[PDB]
């Protein structure tokens, strides 16, 4: 059906930026009554999403006038001319036109500041979770910019993927970082079976891993 | 003013029904579409439905026929929403929106947690430096909430150490259960010399536990 590309997926911004955020349907949005069933919403953190513009172009009311919409065919575009506070979270087109109707992925509109590489902190198993036959190695990678990162865990020199759960902070409103926790978990067995534990975070600040790791044995 | 209540949080059995009402007021509840709108992290915004309150004229995205049953009372300006055969998957914010050519006012939401979990505190383990490292300036420390149900939890360390210190993982749901943490950054001047505590609050079984951060191993 009808696929609503968005890009970027991420806009960051210093406020007062003009922002741009594309939409492109993957097919047009005419509809038989001639019009155009292209909309925009946000919806902040907490909160359910908001319409901004309807039929492509049209402020729904009280939506700030600085957002404005244009396209037609299968490109359209929202407009923020002065980024503002209130301005910032995850931005949806959608198109009405079709059933079943459709939404974008989402431009998640953040600030922008200096690229910051994560303190990463690894953690082996507790005695007190052991004890019960857990196993969960943890990895905080605090504090860093852009949101995108990547974490690897190597058990032994090879990569584990299984058990891994990663949980992002949202940005933080100080000093608009982001950070992550990286859990692998594991039975006591497993955990006990190996000694070189290790969390890789590749980010932007960096064109070799961040490689934070215990030995088992030293633990 | 158009408001669409929704009816609050459910934790329901795997395979259980769900009905999620939506009370509409502010408006002829008649003349407008009642869309109904799946949201699950990491998948956006997904249409479900809609229906036409009075004529029962409904539109029901492919996949949720079988699945979703929309119902509408013009007496009460109530819409209803069926989901039968819960799963995990199912596990989302649910909205209703107010439809017509765009969706110009949603619900609040409902969250539909699925789970075969009694309710379960958390347990709770320390996160702290071991393995016969030195600290430098500043020690990164935590607590791994674990295996809880349902959400949510609070975790506060030493009462006021979100001075800020302090980041929280947002808990991701996983078997049914939950695993969030927290981490928090202290001067090593000031860890293990003094006491750094986690107090974690899991309200939903009147349960609190307070886990005081020692050094997992030589430091
Ligand atoms: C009035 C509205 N009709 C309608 N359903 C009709 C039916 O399928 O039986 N609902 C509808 C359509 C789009 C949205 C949007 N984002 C919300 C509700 C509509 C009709 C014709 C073109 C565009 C919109």
């Known amino acids: 059906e009808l696929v609503m590309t968005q890009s970027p997926l991420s806009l960051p911004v210093s406020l007062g930026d003009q922002a741009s955020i594309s939409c492109r349907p993957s097919?047009?949005?005419?509809?038989?009554?001639?019009?155009?069933?292209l909309h925009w919403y946000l919806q902040k953190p907490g909160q359910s999403p908001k319409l901004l513009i309807y039929?492509?172009?049209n402020r729904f009311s009280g939506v700030p006038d600085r957002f404005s919409g244009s396209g037609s065919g299968t490109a359209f575009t929202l407009k923020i001319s002065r980024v503002e506070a209130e301005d910032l979270g995850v931005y949806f087109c959608?198109?009405?036109?079709?059933?079943?109707?459709?939404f974008g992925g989402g431009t998640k509109l953040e600030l922008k500041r200096a690229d910051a590489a994560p303190t990463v902190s690894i953690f082996p198993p507790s005695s007190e979770q052991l004890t019960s036959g857990g196993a969960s190695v943890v990895c905080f990678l605090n504090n860093f910019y852009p949101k995108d990162i990547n974490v690897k865990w190597k058990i032994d020199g090879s990569e584990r993927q299984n058990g891994v759960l990663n949980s992002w902070t949202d940005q933080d409103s100080k000093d608009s970082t982001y950070s992550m926790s990286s859990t692998l978990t594991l039975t006591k067995d497993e955990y006990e079976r190996h000694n070189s534990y290790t969390c890789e975070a590749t980010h932007k600040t960096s064109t070799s891993p961040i490689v934070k790791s215990f030995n088992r044995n030293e633990c | 003013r158009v408001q669409l209540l929704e009816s609050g949080a459910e934790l329901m059995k795997p395979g259980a029904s769900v009905q999620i009402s939506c009370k509409a007021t502010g408006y002829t509840f008649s003349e407008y579409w009642i869309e109904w709108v799946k949201e699950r992290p990491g998948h956006g915004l997904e249409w479900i439905g809609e229906?036409?309150?009075?004529?029962?004229?409904?539109n029901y995205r492919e996949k949720f026929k079988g699945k979703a049953t929309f119902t509408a009372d013009t007496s009460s300006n109530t819409a209803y929403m069926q989901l039968s055969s819960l799963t995990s998957e199912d596990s989302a914010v649910y909205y209703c929106?107010?439809?017509?050519?765009?969706?110009?006012?949603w619900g609040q939401g409902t969250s539909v947690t699925v789970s075969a979990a009694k309710t379960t505190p958390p347990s709770v383990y320390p996160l702290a430096p071991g393995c016969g490292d030195t600290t430098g300036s500043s020690v990164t420390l935590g607590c791994l909430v674990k295996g809880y149900f349902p959400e949510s939890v609070t975790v506060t360390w030493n009462s006021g150490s979100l001075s800020s210190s302090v980041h929280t993982f947002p808990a991701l749901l996983q078997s049914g259960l939950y695993t969030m943490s927290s981490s928090v950054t202290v001067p090593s001047s000031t860890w293990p010399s003094q006491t750094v505590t986690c107090s974690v609050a899991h309200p939903a079984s009147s349960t609190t536990v307070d886990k005081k951060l020692e050094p997992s191993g030589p430091i």
């Open positions: 229906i036409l309150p009075g004529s029962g004229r409904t």
């Open positions: 929106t107010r439809g017509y050519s765009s969706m110009d006012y």
């Open positions: 959608s198109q009405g036109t079709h059933v079943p109707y459709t």
């Open positions: 039929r492509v172009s």
């Open positions: 097919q047009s949005l005419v509809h038989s009554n001639g019009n155009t069933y």
